[PDB]
């Protein structure tokens, strides 16, 4: 029932250095865990960087070095690349058993910050004709890539009925996600104004739609 | 060299099971520690368990207890996973990886399998339907929504192709068995409504086409 926790997210710049960090909820991270770091690319392409706490897998660079800082263990990039942009797994072992991080998703900022280009589109009358309601809430453009998205009906928030597809990435290197709210027609027609917010980078974009 | 072949993806009903596989190749088979890891969209990697190819000595999360069972045959150099009674909690990406020589000191998770997008339905080849999405009101950005179709995946262009940059497909949804995904595309303000944008939808599962104007709301 142990909690692996990483930093959700990080940014930082070509050049620079970053360190992730992987908190156990047992307690302090020792060797006696032989903390793995392992990174995930796009096209769940897997690679392993560092076992044993700090032994580098063979052709990895040297960039990368696994550490223990205080009571947790820690992966650092020192000259941080664009190749390095990805999802960080570590995973610690504890008495013949291995738990994963839920990973941070790094960013090594290859262009300037983007912010998503939000639309929302309301339900076609033919979906409402089913008795159906789907509000359609396209992001685009967005660097880094990582965002959460919110929606609100006359001024209250929703947990009911929302999915948000995973940030992808565009061919410009930027990405790109969508975000649904399917709602009953009759439900739709009983409120008056819908919204879809998407955070980014400590500010947010909102766009919302009054119902004609 | 190393390799790791799991079939790519596979269909199960909800209440069945699954024998998933990973073919090792490059390497001796019974000398390293195979894992299974589950994951879902967006989400963390889960440990399930692990299998010794060389010894059955195996060792399963607490979480996956009653749901996995790893096995190995090692003269076709596989390992198996075989999942139980299944429900949606178990749609996911699942990867077999190589660990090391030893528990846990001298190695890494230095190769992992494809993985396999196990996904659990209901729903038999079903069509898509599609909605035009117009504005609610520079530049203008319209759509259309491709929903309650089964299987994966569709094909969704714009003016048959015609107009290209600006379009935008994201990824499918998987909603009470059923998928659904949205594309949109960016035009002029101007040139529509004047001229016509119309998504062409078409799905190859159930050999089905829709095209779809979208006019002004």
């Known amino acids: 029932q142990a909690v692996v926790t990483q930093e959700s997210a990080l940014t930082t710049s070509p050049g620079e250095t970053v360190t992730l960090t992987c908190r156990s909820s047992?307690?302090?991270?020792?060797?006696?865990?032989?903390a793995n770091w392992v990174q995930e690319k796009p096209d769940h392409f897997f690679t392993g960087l560092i076992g044993?706490?700090?032994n580098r897998a063979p052709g990895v660079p040297a960039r990368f070095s696994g550490s223990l800082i205080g009571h947790k263990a820690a992966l650092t990039i020192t000259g941080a690349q664009t190749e390095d942009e990805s999802v960080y797994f570590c995973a610690l072992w504890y008495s013949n058993h291995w738990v994963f991080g839920g990973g941070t998703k790094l960013t090594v900022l290859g262009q300037p910050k983007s912010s998503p280009s939000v639309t929302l589109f309301p339900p076609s009358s033919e979906e409402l004709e089913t008795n159906k309601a789907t509000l359609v809430c396209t992001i685009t453009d967005f660097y880094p890539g990582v965002v959460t998205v919110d929606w609100k009906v006359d001024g209250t928030p929703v947990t009911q009925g929302m999915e948000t597809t995973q940030p992808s990435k565009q061919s410009n290197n930027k990405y790109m996600a969508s975000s649904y709210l399917t709602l009953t027609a009759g439900a739709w027609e009983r409120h008056s104004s819908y919204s879809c917010q998407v955070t980014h980078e400590g500010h947010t974009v909102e766009k919302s739609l009054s119902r004609a | 060299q190393v390799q790791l072949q799991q079939s790519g993806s596979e269909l199960v009903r909800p209440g069945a099971s699954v024998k998933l596989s990973c073919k090792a190749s490059?390497?001796?088979?019974?000398?390293?520690?195979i894992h299974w890891v589950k994951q879902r969209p967006g989400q963390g990697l889960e440990w399930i368990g692990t299998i010794y190819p060389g010894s059955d000595n195996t060792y399963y999360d607490e979480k996956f207890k009653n749901k996995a069972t790893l096995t190995v045959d090692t003269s076709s150099s596989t390992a198996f996973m075989q999942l139980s009674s299944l429900t949606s909690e178990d749609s996911a990406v699942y990867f077999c990886?190589?660990?090391?020589?030893?528990?846990?000191?001298?190695?890494?998770?230095?190769?992992w399998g494809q993985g396999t997008l196990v996904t659990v339905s209901a729903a038999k080849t079903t069509p898509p339907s599609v909605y035009p999405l117009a504005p609610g009101s520079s530049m203008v950005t319209l759509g259309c929504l491709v929903k309650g179709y089964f299987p994966e995946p569709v094909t969704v262009t714009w003016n048959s192709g015609s107009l290209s940059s600006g379009v935008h497909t994201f990824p499918a949804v998987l909603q009470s068995d059923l998928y659904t995904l949205t594309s949109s595309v960016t035009v002029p303000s101007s040139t529509w409504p004047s001229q016509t944008v119309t998504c062409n939808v078409a799905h190859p599962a159930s050999s089905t086409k829709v095209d779809k104007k979208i006019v002004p709301r």
């Open positions: 490059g390497y001796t088979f019974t000398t390293y520690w």
């Open positions: 990886t190589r660990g090391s020589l030893y528990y846990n000191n001298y190695g890494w998770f230095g190769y």
């Open positions: 047992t307690g302090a991270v020792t060797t006696r865990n032989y």
């Open positions: 044993d706490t700090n």
